[PDB]
Design a protein around this ligand. Structure first.
Ligand SMILES: CCCCN(CCC1CCCCC1)Cc1ccc(C(=O)N[C@@H](CCSC)C(=O)O)c(-c2ccccc2C)c1
Ligand SMILES: CC(C)CCCC(C)CCCC(C)C[C@@H](O)P(=O)(O)O
Ligand SMILES: [Zn+2]
Lengths: 397, 315
């Protein structure tokens, strides 16, 4: 049956060593609700809900894309992301985006774009590399002579150069903070709109490295605990910067891998911390990169079939513990769905279903054959094709 | 003088001190996307914020206006920006400010702008006295708030405040030895103060680490830290480590060990050792238990340590 379900899988439960500390307790409670889910098949189990609410998440996404309740008042200043998650999530699920919204989206983002490069949380807000990423990384999903033109590649570059700091790392926004998160946005963007000068990220690779701590993973800023989100940022930025090898790849792999839960099946952003869907991409997003890393470096051993993580046990979690009855996906069972997770919780499924190291390919689609999503680029988390198109565009300039 | 929660709170249009100005409706274009139906109170505030911001009005009233724009969305970096400004110009009392930000942060600790806004103030006053204690209280609600720890690392570096941190680390360690964040804190206070090259220091830690290992065999932190402070020099450099870890197979087994060994045997296979054939299997063997028994979920990985080790150790 499904790995997660198997009998002897209840060996991978928590042994707290008859000791108890908040971490223990919490991990304990999760293992309960997570178990209850798996065990929840004793009465009927013919064609399990091992289905992916294609249409159900669609309403949530289709609708949420045009209007959001007063609840979303907290995302008031990150509106372009609210576009990015949805547009992406759709592509993953595979719903053509209406060529009429296409404009509106563009027409919207064009309104956030500050006259001084980059984009803003919304109409009339100061430019900031997060939304700016969102916006650009979004415009590219649309990939039309219309989207591509929205971006003022000239100014974007100037903005970037402003956040640019001496030690290499950029600020987030003017007078804002600094952490890998920053560099990744710069890189991700500049590369797409092909606006990189040989003197932009001077030192940046060097900095993103000072981030990799004693745990082999990477942290927000030098000295900070290893964290999956930042890690993805750091590595990805370097896959762009073509510096992967600058880190201790072996000390890194060891970690990521330990990030998967020997029980649940998903990942934990940090050692000794509850599991969490979105990280299904943040963490497991890493291996498809670490693959390109080693292989490039010239390593044999690397498989030719999967990624270095239990792809099944991951899907077996995203599916049995992260989908909402009503729609959209989430953190862990019993947690208010939101377009963020609904995004990265799926991106984290595409990863686990698809493999493409070399000209060869081999998927592993758990659940019903109607659960295969579209591929997702390992570094940008967008159509592996909308990416090729995007670049193969701005380059002609 | 009011608050946004006080019953006697009134919108701004319905106010006198605010009748000599016209609101600025957020233009979302003819055909809006991902639009929010802002509540009356919320939508109102900002219509007024804009009007100010747009008029770069460095007024005392705009200031108060911000506090509210912040309560509605303390995640709005723009509003935070225009705030520091008002602080600059109106030349406001910064402690009067510190008190305000301690509050907010206490309220929404998982925020970015609210923290960075505390750092700004602090570097302005050049006085971190309050910090170490504050952060601590935050850490006493969430012994793992990233921001809290990060803010702390900065406050400790920028102001050379080490002296009494290693105690702190040890303290919270009792509280919850499994706290991976605290473990990272330790290796911050040491690598930056005494370092681990010191024979006594590296000695001291490793010993202790092992302690926490025996006390709680499955604490995946104690182990990552043991492998953590001994991995640079390589493990083959500390022979005894391979025997002690062997006196744990019984009432202390854990896949966290199975691996350390393998790890050890790896570094050994990288340093011309005797029995460059007895270990090479003694370990490839241990990779089995992992992938098929003790740590199967990581089967795919192990089934690579195996391959890798063979791929470079034969004939
Ligand atoms: C237990 C702590 C949980 C932290 N978590 C936030 C959960 C959010 C998800 C969205 C609905 C509300 C709750 C993850 C997280 C961490 C950092 C950022 C992050 O990047 N930080 C900035 C984002 C600025 S977008 C202008 C901040 O100001 O907080 C974000 C993020 C990402 C995109 C949009 C909005 C947010 C909050 C999310
Ligand atoms: C913006 C990105 C590309 C990636 C962000 C990745 C993250 C999920 C970041 C997590 C932030 C941290 C350290 C946690 C905070 O929520 P807290 O300090 O409250 O625990
Ligand atoms: Zn999450």
């Amino acid at each position: 049956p499904l790995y997660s379900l198997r009998p002897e899988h209840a060996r991978e439960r928590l042994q707290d060593d008859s000791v108890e500390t908040v971490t223990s307790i919490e991990q304990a409670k999760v293992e309960e609700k997570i178990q209850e889910v798996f065990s929840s098949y004793k009465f009927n189990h013919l064609v399990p809900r091992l289905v992916l609410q294609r249409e159900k998440h669609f309403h949530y996404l289709k609708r949420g894309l045009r209007q959001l309740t007063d609840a979303y008042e907290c995302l008031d200043a990150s509106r372009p992301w609210l576009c990015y998650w949805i547009l992406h999530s759709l592509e993953l699920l595979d719903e053509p985006i209406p060529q009429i919204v296409a404009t509106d989206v563009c027409q919207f983002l064009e309104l956030c774009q500050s006259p001084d490069g980059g984009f803003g949380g919304g109409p009339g807000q100061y430019p900031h590399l997060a939304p700016t990423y969102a916006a650009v990384n979004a415009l590219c999903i649309i990939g039309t002579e219309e989207a591509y033109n929205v971006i003022n590649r000239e100014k974007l570059l100037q903005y970037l150069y402003s956040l640019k700091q001496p030690d290499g790392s950029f600020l987030m926004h003017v007078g804002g903070e600094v952490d890998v998160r920053s560099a990744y946005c710069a890189a991700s963007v500049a590369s797409l709109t092909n606006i990189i000068t040989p003197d932009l990220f001077e030192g940046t690779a060097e900095w993103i490295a000072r981030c990799q701590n004693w745990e082999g993973g990477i942290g927000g800023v030098p000295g900070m605990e290893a964290h999956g989100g930042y890690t993805f940022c750091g590595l990805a930025a370097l896959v762009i910067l073509k510096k992967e090898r600058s880190l201790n790849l072996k000390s890194l792999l060891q970690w990521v891998t330990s990030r998967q839960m020997r029980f649940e099946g998903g990942f934990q952003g940090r050692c000794n911390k509850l599991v969490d869907g979105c990280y299904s991409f943040w963490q497991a997003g890493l291996l498809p990169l670490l693959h390109r890393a080693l292989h490039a470096q010239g390593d044999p051993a690397l498989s030719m079939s999967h990624w270095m993580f239990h792809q099944q046990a991951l899907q077996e979690y995203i599916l049995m513990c992260c989908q909402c009855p009503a729609g959209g996906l989430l953190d862990k069972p019993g947690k208010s769905r939101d377009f963020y997770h609904t995004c990265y919780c799926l991106s984290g499924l595409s990863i686990a279903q698809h493999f493409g190291s070399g000209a060869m390919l081999h998927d592993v689609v758990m659940g019903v054959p109607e659960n295969v999503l579209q591929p997702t680029h390992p570094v940008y988390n967008i159509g592996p094709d909308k990416v090729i198109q995007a670049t193969t565009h701005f380059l002609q300039k | 003088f009011l608050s946004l929660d006080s019953p006697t709170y009134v919108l701004y249009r319905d106010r006198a001190e605010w009748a000599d100005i016209d609101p600025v409706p957020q233009n979302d274009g003819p055909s809006p996307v991902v639009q929010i139906i802002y509540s009356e109170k919320f939508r109102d505030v900002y219509d007024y914020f804009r009007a100010v911001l747009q008029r770069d009005e460095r007024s005392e009233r705009a200031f108060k206006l911000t506090r509210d724009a912040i309560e509605l969305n303390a995640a709005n970096y723009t509003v935070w920006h225009f705030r520091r400004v008002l602080l600059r110009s109106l030349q406001k009392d910064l402690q009067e400010e510190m008190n305000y930000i301690i509050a907010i942060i206490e309220e929404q600790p998982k925020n970015y702008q609210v923290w960075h806004h505390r750092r700004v103030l602090v570097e302005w006053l050049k006085d971190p006295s309050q910090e170490l204690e504050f952060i601590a209280d935050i850490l006493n609600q969430d012994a793992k708030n990233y921001h809290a720890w990060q803010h702390r690392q900065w406050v400790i570096q920028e102001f050379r405040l080490w002296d009494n941190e290693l105690q702190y680390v040890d303290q919270l360690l009792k509280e919850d030895v499994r706290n991976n964040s605290v473990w990272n804190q330790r290796h911050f206070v040491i690598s930056n103060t005494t370092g681990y090259s010191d024979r006594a220091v590296l000695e001291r830690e490793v010993q202790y680490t092992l302690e926490m290992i025996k006390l709680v065999p499955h604490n995946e932190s104690a182990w990552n830290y043991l492998k953590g402070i001994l991995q640079d020099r390589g493990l083959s450099r500390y022979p005894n480590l391979l025997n002690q870890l062997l006196d744990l197979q019984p009432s202390h087994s854990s896949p966290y060990l199975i691996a350390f060994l393998v790890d050890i045997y790896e570094d050994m296979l990288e340093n011309q050792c005797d029995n460059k054939e007895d270990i090479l299997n003694k370990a490839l063997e241990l990779c089995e238990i992992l992938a098929k028994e003790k740590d199967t979920i990581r089967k795919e990985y192990w089934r690579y340590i195996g391959r890798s080790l063979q791929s470079k150790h034969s004939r």
